[PDB]
Amino acid sequence: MEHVAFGSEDIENTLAKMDDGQLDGLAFGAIQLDGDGNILQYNAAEGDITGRDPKQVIGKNFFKDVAPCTDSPEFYGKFKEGVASGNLNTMFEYTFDYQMTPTKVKVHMKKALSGDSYWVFVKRV
């Protein structure tokens, strides 16, 4: 179990050293997206929250395929502005309700250390 706290100010540096094996040891959900919203990494904790099987969602588009409930100005809109601008760091509450029991979460989106990749961190509230 990797000791990293949700919302840590230097979270991008710490997660840069993790492979999709060490990501599964986080206490919160973590998804890594490319600039188009395609899923590059998806950890075990996220699968526990949402029911998705990590290996099966990698490669899919988060906003178009996996999470249509996030295709809105309040989530996808913030992501798109972040990708276009070059920086992103925002935290907000949201409800995930597609093909699942509605679940309230806290989401933290932040640009990764690498060029065109972005993190989406999730925890229950």
From Swiss-Prot:
SMART domains recorded: PAS
Positions where S-(4-hydroxycinnamyl)cysteine occurs in the chain: C69
Pfam families (alphabetical): PAS
Keywords: Chromophore, Photoreceptor protein, Receptor, Sensory transduction
InterPro entries: PAS, PAS-like_dom_sf, PAS_fold, PYP
Modification comment: The 4-hydroxycinnamic acid (p-coumaric acid) chromophore is covalently bound via a thioester linkage.
Domain (PAS): residue spans on this chain: 23-86
Family: Belongs to the photoactive yellow protein family.
Free-text function comment from the UniProt entry: Photoactive blue light protein. Probably functions as a photoreceptor for a negative phototaxis response.
Record-given protein name: Photoactive yellow protein
Lineage of the organism: Bacteria, Pseudomonadati, Pseudomonadota, Gammaproteobacteria, Chromatiales
